[PDB]
Symmetry: C3
Subunit: 138 residues, 3 copies
């Protein structure tokens, strides 16, 4: 099985480890490692720190995906979804939440704001050609 090393920064010690809700969940939940609650006005973005520093193994990546509950109930989503967490990233993972609703939103301390999904990547060799004909065409 693939192992995922996670190191909890000072502002993520009291919060629980990212875990799977169900034995067939696709991703681990990400929490807002914030001090005081955060107020997100409509139509602007906010950089929320998670307090996690991960070692994603070779051949795999991390994807910061939105939470379906926060998206429908409050109009909140991850701006750059799917956030590409490269396997060689050693800094603090951060989530860019943006409010596409027309009404104020508040994110509390330790609230699940996104989900990190670990998936295999295919690194391709790039060659320039001068392509095959298909039925889909252009």
């Amino acid at each position: 099985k693939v192992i995922l090393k996670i190191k909890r920064l000072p502002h993520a010690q009291d919060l629980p480890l990212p875990s799977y809700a169900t034995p067939h969940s696709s991703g681990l939940d990400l929490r807002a490692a914030i001090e005081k609650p955060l107020k997100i006005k409509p139509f602007e973005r906010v950089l929320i720190p998670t307090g996690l520093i991960l070692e994603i193994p070779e051949g795999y990546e991390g994807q910061v995906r939105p939470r379906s509950g926060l998206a429908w109930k409050k109009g909140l989503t991850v701006l750059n979804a799917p956030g590409t967490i490269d396997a060689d990233y050693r800094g603090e993972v951060k989530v860019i939440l943006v409010n596409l609703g027309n009404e104020e939103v508040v994110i509390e301390r330790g609230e699940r704001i996104a989900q990190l999904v670990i998936a295999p990547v295919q690194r391709v060799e790039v060659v320039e050609v001068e392509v095959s004909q298909t039925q889909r065409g252009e």
Copy 2:
């Protein structure tokens, strides 16, 4: 060879089954299983039912992705894209469309509003460490 079991709810029994458009398309067509045409004002979001209950096989997941056509022509996109459909999900798959254009948009009966891509997802074993490896890109 992998199979996908789909149960069509009564409001999706008349609509056609999800099918790959081309012999090498990546996703299935997701249709709005609604009776009346839906109007989405600018900056509005709607939860549209598909009438579909999926049996995504173990080791694979479902991703609700936006349509390139509706995105450019009208500004419609999936709010939680890529919408994660877990393998053990037995509920009715729903789609959250948001109108990020400047005009009102109408979603008609059984209209292609998203695409569902089946892709392999990797279950990992979470392990907490006190130090990570120093690496090229750094922070």
Copy 3:
């Protein structure tokens, strides 16, 4: 061995070929093969040509993913992210940008606007059933 084949058009012959910024980078750089800068009005979308024509291997696909820096510093993103590039696509790949910030953005010619990630896609056979297996998650 996996191989991605790219045919470049005249308006994208001077840009560097899409490559990985780091040996462990997930996605290739996608650049705007345009002429003049782009007047990105807030809350407006645009269709940018890259000048690339790809031949993705069967069972694989390409994904247009937003850049993190452009999303935080200027509020730009790919509207249809992730942009599904089908394996049988033989046309020019285009990127749909959109401004979600409160300032106008200027897009330079050849500037990195998104990343292209190659990932394996699984073809599946749609067999309609009258019952799905019971799980612990249940009907969510």
